[PDB]
Structure formats: C-alpha cells, structure tokens
C-alpha cells in the first residue's frame, strides 16, 4: 500500500504490494466490523480478487512511471527519452553496385539473381541486365538482411545460374556502404545516449563527439580538447599546436560524410591537429579533407585519425560447475561484450583497455555458475602471430590512442 | 499526399493498401486526445500514439524508413469533425521527406 | 443457370494467341 | 436501405448505375486460376445509356481491325456495395474486372441487359513483355507474375525458397502466368488475384491474422461440409477472399472455431430479397 | 486476465467492452458461476465500479505513456519540456484601462461590471464602484472581458449597460491603457522549441551569415574562419590574428541592426579581425563598433569590413537584328543582372569575379536574336576615371572582400 522512491541509488519507484490486508480493513467497518473475512468464502474471495487487482494496479503504474528514466526502459519508451534529447532512433538498409561478372556469351543474368559472400552473404541483383557479347558485365547489387556488413573484395559463391556463367566478383571500384541497423542496437542504446547526449549542441567537444557518433558506422569517437595551449601532451596524444580537437573515429564510414559532419561541428576557429606520427593512423596524410563550407566561401581541410587496430586473444579457464555443461559459449559472450551488445557497459572501443577483470565479468554475466578461474588476454598489433603463453597478463593499458578486437576465434576455453 | 477518408466514430479502424505497404490505423478517442494504434504488413508498429496537428504519427524514424511513408493530420483530431473539417494525408518517402525538411527549419 | 456457366466456359478457352 | 453502385470506367467518365434502377449482382470469387466471375441484370434502362454502354462493350476492334495497344480495348468496371442508414455509408468494393459478354434477358416493356464480368479479363496484354526468369526461386517468379500483371502482390508461404528450371517458358500471355503459379504447388498453396491484388499463399493460412473476421448472427445455420464451415450472411463490408473468420454460431455449437475463406458468393439485388454473401471456408492453420 | 497492457510498442488500450467482460468473468470465477451480474444487484455494482476502474488507469497510463517526447506532448508536460531552453508558455491577462473619463449629473453611482464598449467591439467590465462628484465627471477603472492585446484607442467610448444619470465615457489620454496577452498554444510551443533547435544546430560560420542574411538590406555576406593557428593568407584574405573570423557584409543596412545579428550569432572566444590593410573596408575605425546585450546590461564590441567597391565598366559591339532594340534595353539588363534581379544567377555579390563572358549570357538571355560581336570587362577604384581603351579584358577576377557595381552608364553599347 504504498510507493517507495529511491531516491538517489536505483532512482526507481517500487511498489510495495502487502495490499491485501488494506481491501481487508477496507471490507472491515464499511461492511461492518465482524465480516468473516476468511478464504473459502464470497467476501474472502472477492477481497482477494480486489488485492491481487489493486497490487496488478500498482505494478503498472510504477512500471509506466519508471519508464521516464532510463536504464529501466525499452523499445518506445525510452526512444521517448531519446528524441527528448534528439537522439534518433535510427533505420535499417541494404544496397551495393558496380559489382563485375564474368560470365559465358550473352547470358541473361536476371534480377534477383542469388549470391553468397563468407559471412552468409545473400546478395541479389537490383534489375536484370543481359550479358554483353564481349563477356564482362557489372550489376548493381543489394543485401538480403538488413545489418551491417562487409563484402570481401573477391567473388565467393553464387546460387542462380543458366550453368554458363562462371563467376561474379568485387572490384575495388564497386561502392559499398556499411548500412545501418534498426536497434541492431537495443540494449545499447543505453550506452550510446551517454555518448550522444549533446547531438542537439555545437561548437564543444561533446556536441563533436555526438555527431561524429551520428554518422553512420561510426563505432566510437575520441575527441580530445587542448584547453591548456603549450603543445605537450593532454590525456594522451602528444599535441603539436597549443589549440586544437584531436578525433579518432573507428568504424568503417564515408570520408566525406564524416568530414561534413566534423566541419558542421567545429566550434568557431580552433584547428585540427592529428600529428605525433604514431598518434593514431593519418586519414590522408598532410591536408585532409577539403570539404566545402555551407556557409558559401573557401575550401577548408578538416582532420581526424583512425585508431591503431589491436587484435587480442582471451584464455579462459573454467570448472564446468554446477552441473551445467556449455563448451563454446564463453567465447560468444566475450565477443558480445567487446561488441557491446551487453547493457551499460560499453565493450572494446577506441578509448578502451582490454582487462582481463572485465572480460571474467562479462563470462559471469552471461553465463554463471561455471567459476572462472584464470582469464589471462594480453594482446597484439593487427597482423603478427600468438604472443605465446608468456604474454597472456592480467591487463593491458591499450591507450587513448588505438582501439582493440576480440575475435571469435581467439578466445580458448579450457575446464578444469 | 493521399487522402484517407474518415468517419465520425469515435473509435474505429481504417484497413488500407498505401505505398506498397498494407497498413491498418485504429483511431480511438482516449479521455480528452486522440490515440491510433498503427500496424503496417500484420505486425504491430505502434501503439497509442497520442494524435496533434501537423507531427507525424509514425515519429521515431526506423518506422518510417527506408521510405515508408507517413501519417500526418492537418489539425488536432477530433472524431466530431472527421471527414469533413478534418483529414488524414499519406505521404510517402519522398514526400514526407520533403515535409521533414520543412518542419525541421520553421 | 447453366447458359452462365457455358458462358463462363467458353471465356476460359479465349487467349492472345490462335496457337 | 441497401446502397448497390455499378461504376463503369468509360472514355466519358465514370457513369455509375445506382441502386434506384433494378439492378442484380451475382458474383463468385475463389481461390483458384479462374477468374472470379460476376453476372449482372440490369433494367430500366434508357436508349441513350444502352447506346452509351452496350455499343462500348465489344469483341471486335481486336480481331478484325487493330485499334488496341493498352486498356481501354475493353470497359473496366467495379461495383460497390454495402448499406446506408442514419446518414453514414458502407460503401466497400466487392469486384473489379472487365465485360466479356452481353445480352438481353427481359425484353419489353423494360428491357433489361445482362453483361458478364470477369476479373482480369485483360488477358489481350503484350504477349509477355519481359522474359521469366531463367533460374529463380519460387517468390521471385511470383514478384515477376505480379510485375507483369501490374498488380501488387502479397507473396506469404513456406514454398518461397525453393528453386525453379525454367518457371514458365511456355506461357503465352498475362493470363497464364496465374495458371502456371497455381499449376506449380498444387497440394495447397494456390495463387489467386482478388481485385487487384494478387495472392500467392498456403491454403491453409490466413493472408491477414489481425483482420479476422468475428460472425455471431448468419442466415439459415452455419453448417459442416467435406472441408470446412460453410456459411451465409448478411452483406457486411469486411469480408473478403481467403481472409480469416471467427465463427462463433447458436444453433451449431461444434461449429465455432477460426476459419480461412475458401470461397465467397455474393448475390446484390437492391430491389429483390436476396442480398446475402455465401462463405466457404477451412480450418486455418 | 490483465494481460500485459504495457507491453514495448507503447501502452494498449482495449475497449471498454472486453474490460467489462474481463472484470465480469473475474466476478463469475469468484462469487459463483452462475451469479446475476445484473447492474442493479450489488454484484453487479460492484462489476460496473471494477470496470470504470482499471479502464481509467488504462487510459491515464496510454495519455501520459510517451510524455517526455516533445514533439507530441501536451499541457504542464510541454511547458516543462520547453522551460529547459527558457520558453516559457505566456499568461493569458486581458487589457487594463485606468482613469476612464465618465460624464455624468450629480451623484449617479456606477456599479461594478457596467460593461462599456469601445467602437469595434471590445466590450470591457468596470472593475471598480465610483460616484460621480459635483463637478460631473470622473474617472473608472475597466478590464477586457476577453484575453489578449485588446485596442483600447483615445476615444468615446460607448456604454451597452447604463444607469441613469451616466451620460458617456471616454478614453482621455492620461489613461494608462496595461496591455494583455493570450496565452501560447501548444503547437506554437513545440514550433519555438523547433526554431531553438534550428539556432543552436549551427556552427560560428552558418550560424554568422543566417544571422547576418536576415537583416534587411543586407544584399550578400562573406564569412571566413582562419582555424590555422598562424597569421596567414588561407584563400585570399590575409588575416592579423592566428585564431580569427572575418566576415563582410554588403549592401547598406544599419550599422546596429548588424552589429546585433552579429553579436547574436557570435561564436565566442574567437574574436573578430578587421584583417591587414585593404582587405575590405575596416569601417568603424580601428575599435569595433559596440552593442548592448539583450540578455545583460554589459556590452560586446563586434568588427566586420564593407567589401571593397569597384566601378565595372562594360564594352560591348552588338550587332543589332531583325528586331529593333535601343542600347538603353542592353544596359538595363546588365544593371538588373549586376544587381542579381535575376534568377538562378546570383550577379556581382562580394567575392564574385567580373566575366564579361557570363555578361554576354546576361545579355543574350535578356535580349534574344541580337548577334555579339565582342563583349569586354574592366574593373576601377570607386570614384575614378574611367578606363582607358586597351585596359579592357575579356575577363577580371576580383578578390574575396571586393564587390563590383554596374551602373548605365559604365556600360558602352556600340551597334556595328
């Protein structure tokens, strides 16, 4: 019978339930003072029914209330609070072209036609074109599912055919755009609100993170400020000038669009530094994007760096406990997290730092009751072989500089 | 822009082809509002979205994109006035395009 | 009737082409 | 106070023959290759509107002469019904198609025609305009049906990834095409076309599982058949072909249960008693 | 037999109808199978109450379910949204005439709420009981009986509900007519939020020239952002400061009126620069000209430069047609092309070079049919000679602060 508010910890508004004794007293000395109130009975059960009705009340109305928060909501409720700060909820798409096909003579190559990349690729042509005699075609082509995907540059496998065409394939002239996905970012758009809590804003580190973070695939942004103006170095990244935003931007998105972004968000006149050599990876070298400023007048050059990449590796050892057998799920809820599907904490991203603490937290999350015992992960360079077991530590710094992977695959299991 | 006739009933539902989309909009009258729970192909897409003048019903963008369309009222609704007073207009992708680029600069 | 479904029958046997 | 329209599509317009003159509608609609079919009497009508009608309606022009490259070869007509009182309508769509025959059944002193319409009956189309596909699965040979038919198309059934060789190399004209997607797959999933739009779905699943239909009140008694419920009704503007229906009878109780329409007979006559929708339907699944 | 009415998709609310018998069913359940749920037994009653409730919930729950989405919500809800960015919904007052002049005889009393009227409607209610003394005349006190702005112009005002013994009323010009105002709408609400939103999603440059473009006479803007870090030529204009905007105006509108847009549209932190020596009018003097902030009672100084005036001179040798045209017809169109009467062409705005190829389009278009022989270009200082044979180019390209003017009579029609 009453509303508890919490009202710094969990923020939350919980009902109390223990109701049942208030319908009771609510019978009593409105229907009398020595109504039978006891099961077994028309009044016991109606006081019942009335209770459980009046607890289901309280349940939705606390529920309904907790929803202005976030942290507690879901789909349509907490985009409510999303578009408050007009953070978008965000669409889906699918859609390739210039892909080549090398073919017999005069084929009829008609739409739809079924292909296959690695990762289930599902590819169909847009319209029907019909083979040129000298053999060589390019189609334009779209993808089944509605994720973000990356098709090799070379031709794997396709389904329809008259038997003489032999092959398509992916040129580096072919235009691919990583689509964006619904939300999928569902229990992370928790996290990505925190980040892009200022889209609304401009001319502030912040308000360029959010909408550098706005752009489609555009994983994870840093942005760094220079407020003290002696070059040296702040929270990482030597600084060559005194004034100027240094932005790291991961993911796989259009130079243009993002340099559009980044010039729309630019805060008045302070420039762009990205030197240091090692201080991530230069987008084009000296003099960076032009792009054109909507203001009409000059072509400006705006400049960012993208993360040195890192892969990592994850050995896991485990005691099966419980009673509980599960051979190969361990290494999905790692890569869930360093994806950052998990809620409220964010996964491997450019500002991160693979621990080996975290990593055993995320096993324990997804799966408990199998007790973790060692979690070593260590880590390399993109390319290189195994650091061998003599590197796997407890931790590694990964500075602001850099972002790291977890493949599948790296991540070995063993029971104990 | 198209047109969706209405009938002066405070609660109802209008089952229609739009934009190569089957959508089917139950327009009720809640205390003193209007709210339409709108599906679109079998599968619901949202439900009780309180109805106004001028604001998309479908406003978080994944239900409108890629050009899905929109549903917008010329004002306020009102059952009372359905039909004639009042109407609700489709737009598509390109039109309601067009209309957000509009309304995003008043 | 059944003139209707005589109709009907011979509707069925009409397409584009004599062959 | 029954509301029953004839609306012609003429190169003067529309001339929609109300429900003040004697008019009688007997349509048949069916999930099948056939095109669904309506019968239509016609009385009171004048010399000038026979001259405007009758003298349209034609199988020549295509035959013995050329004058055809699009519609307009053949008159299209839809019909609305449904029932108005208190001032609002329920004025629906019930059929959509083409003339093919004409005659006259009463003569005078009312002289009283009766055409046939048939759904789809622009069969006379560019002889296929775009080639088949030449492998493709069975969703896409229905996406490229619908496409050359003009009609949208609501493809829902378990048969759609699977491949064909050669998915309709023989058909000669637009017509065809329903009869190949019926020929293919003929235990249960049989493709229509109903007004204009064209379903290809299981028989045994509802194109639309939000739109069921609820019946309480029939005339006569819902029944059992060899597959399903067989009932009548009153015209009520929400039932149509192959969409799902919530039986819930009186004088048959083991009848109840939800329902796929299978078939539909609808019989209109403004100024005759009949005026009732006949439903076949089986159980869904 | 709740169900979940909360569900993700927003709140579902069933009809009236299947509450009722939801809630009938529950009472059936409990109290017997075959109980009278009739509406005038006690069960009955008791059904109807159950099912006002938890249908009042259900609708109170679906009207406040997605409050804090502000391009939907309503009421107290959107006044609370709208008060983050300082819109604040008015109050409807209504207007507040005092010392109303009232002729009358004698003692003659006139009571609260008289109901004079003005001229064109606007009936307004006395608001004070007075007595006319013995020199005949006094003054009232009235208040609108609608809401707004109401006119209450100098004037007789007509009386609709008199005693006997008050002979008229008038508005003399001693009294203090106190507007009223009428309240803010709900849309026009969310529309202020969507016009804050436009303001502040703009960087230091766009947001410089929509300012400075809406004010009137204001023909073209130039807005140039150094964001280098050193005292440089970027494009053409060179600067005095490393970190530095410049912008230019044209056209001849009023030195506050800009001087506010500017100071409005102010980035902050990066100052303005009249630039070095001839880089456009440093008008104003050395120091730039200051403004009052609307919000606080401390002021801004703001610089911005007039574009270099140049005098164009035009040469061109038409052969005349078969129609007949005067040379007066040639100059007025380039006049009207130069000033940018035009359409799609923007003319000779600031930083917009001289080509007396693009003159020839003007002309042709303008005047069809006439043959051009040679058109030429020549560009002088404001209040010169004018140039001399030989000076004239096929082609003057003009810098990023100057603009050139056309007149009549700087255009030579030779018809040869």
Not at chain 1, 239 to 250: I, N
Not at chain 4, 22 to 36: E, G, H, P, T, W
Not at chain 4, 239 to 256: H, K
Not at chain 4, 260 to 273: G, H
Request: proline share 5%; aromatic share 8%; charged share 20%.
């Amino acid at each position: 019978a009453n509303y508890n508010y919490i009202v710094d910890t969990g923020v939350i508004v919980a009902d109390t339930a223990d109701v049942l004794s208030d319908v009771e007293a609510e019978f009593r000395a409105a229907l009398g003072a020595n109504i039978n109130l006891a099961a077994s009975t028309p009044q016991g059960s109606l006081v019942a029914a009335e209770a459980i009705a009046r607890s289901s009340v309280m349940r939705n109305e606390a529920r309904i209330a907790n929803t202005i928060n976030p942290n507690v909501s879901f789909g349509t409720f907490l985009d409510a609070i999303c578009a408050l700060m007009g953070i978008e909820r965000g669409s889906d798409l699918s859609t390739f072209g210039y892909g080549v096909q090398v073919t017999g003579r005069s084929q009829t190559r008609i739409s739809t036609g079924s292909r296959v990349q690695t990762p289930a690729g599902a590819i169909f042509t847009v319209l029907s074109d019909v083979t040129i005699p000298a053999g060589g075609v390019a189609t334009i082509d779209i993808k089944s599912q509605e994720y973000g995907n990356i098709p090799l540059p070379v031709g794997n496998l396709i389904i329809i055919d008259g038997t003489i065409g032999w092959s398509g394939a992916k040129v580096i002239a072919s235009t691919r755009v990583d689509p964006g996905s619904r939300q999928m970012s569902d229990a992370e758009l928790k996290n990505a609100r925190v980040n892009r809590l200022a889209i609304q804003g401009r001319n502030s580190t912040m308000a360029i993170k959010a909408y550098v973070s706005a752009v489609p695939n555009v994983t994870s942004v840093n942005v760094i400020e220079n407020n003290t103006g002696a070059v040296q170095v702040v929270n990482g990244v030597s600084f060559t000038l005194p004034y100027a935003v240094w932005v790291c931007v991961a993911g796989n998105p259009d130079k243009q669009a993002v340099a559009d972004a980044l010039w729309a968000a630019h805060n008045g006149g302070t420039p762009w530094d990205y030197g240091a050599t090692n201080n991530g990876v230069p987008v084009d070298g000296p003099n960076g994007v032009p792009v054109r400023d909507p203001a009409s007048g000059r072509k400006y050059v705006v400049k960012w760096t993208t993360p040195i990449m890192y892969d990592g590796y994850v050995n896991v050892t485990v005691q099966q406990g419980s009673s509980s057998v599960a051979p190969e799920a361990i290494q999905n809820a790692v890569v869930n997290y360093a994806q950052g599907k998990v809620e409220g904490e964010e996964g491997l991203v450019v500002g991160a730092s693979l621990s080996a603490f975290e990593v055993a937290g995320a096993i324990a999350r997804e799966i408990p009751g199998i007790y973790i015992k060692l979690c070593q992960v260590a880590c390399v360079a993109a390319g290189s072989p195994a650091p061998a077991p003599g590197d796997f530590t407890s931790e590694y710094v990964m500075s602001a500089f850099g972002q790291a992977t977890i493949s599948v695959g790296n991540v070995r299991v063993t029971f104990v | 822009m198209k047109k969706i006739p209405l009938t002066a009933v405070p609660n109802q539902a209008i089952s229609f082809n739009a934009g190569s989309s089957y959508w089917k909009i139950r327009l009720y009258q809640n205390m003193d509002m209007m709210n339409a729970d709108i599906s679109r192909d079998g599968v619901i897409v949202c439900h009780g979205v309180r109805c106004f003048g001028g604001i998309p019903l479908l406003q978080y963008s994944r239900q409108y994109r890629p050009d899905y369309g929109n549903f917008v009222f010329d004002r306020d609704a009102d059952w009372t006035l359905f039909g004639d007073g009042i109407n609700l207009f489709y737009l598509d992708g390109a039109e309601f395009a067009e209309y957000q680029a509009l309304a995003t600069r008043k | 009737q059944l003139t209707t479904a005589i109709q009907d029958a011979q509707n069925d046997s009409a397409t584009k082409i004599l062959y | 106070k029954r509301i029953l329209r004839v609306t012609f599509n003429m190169p003067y317009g529309p001339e929609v023959i109300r429900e003040d003159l004697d008019v009688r509608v007997r349509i048949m609609k069916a999930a099948l290759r056939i095109q669904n079919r309506a019968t239509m009497e016609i009385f009171g009508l004048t010399t000038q509107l026979r001259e405007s009608l009758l003298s349209q309606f034609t199988a020549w022009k295509h035959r013995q002469r050329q004058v055809g490259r699009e519609d307009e070869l053949m008159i299209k007509v839809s019909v609305e019904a449904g029932y108005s009182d208190q001032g609002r309508e329920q004025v629906s769509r019930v059929f959509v198609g083409e003339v093919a025959i004409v005659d006259i059944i009463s003569p005078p002193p009312d002289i009283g025609i009766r055409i046939q319409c048939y759904t789809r009956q622009i069969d006379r189309t560019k002889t296929i305009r775009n080639m088949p596909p030449a492998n493709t699965t069975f969703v896409k040979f229905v996406e490229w049906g619908a496409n050359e038919m003009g009609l949208n198309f609501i493809c829902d059934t378990s048969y759609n990834d699977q491949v064909l060789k050669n998915p309709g190399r023989s058909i000669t004209v637009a017509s065809a095409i329903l009869a190949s997607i019926q020929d293919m797959y003929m235990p249960d999933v049989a493709a229509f076309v109903d007004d204009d739009i064209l379903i290809v779905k299981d028989r045994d699943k509802v194109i639309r599982p939000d739109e069921v239909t609820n019946v309480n009140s029939f005339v006569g008694i819902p029944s059992w058949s060899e597959w399903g419920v067989e009932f009548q009704c009153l015209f009520e503007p929400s039932i149509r072909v192959a969409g799902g229906v919530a039986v819930e009878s009186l004088m048959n109780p083991s009848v109840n249960g939800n329902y796929v329409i299978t078939a539909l007979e609808y019989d209109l006559a403004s100024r005759d008693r009949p005026f009732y929708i006949k439903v076949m339907g089986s159980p869904a699944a």
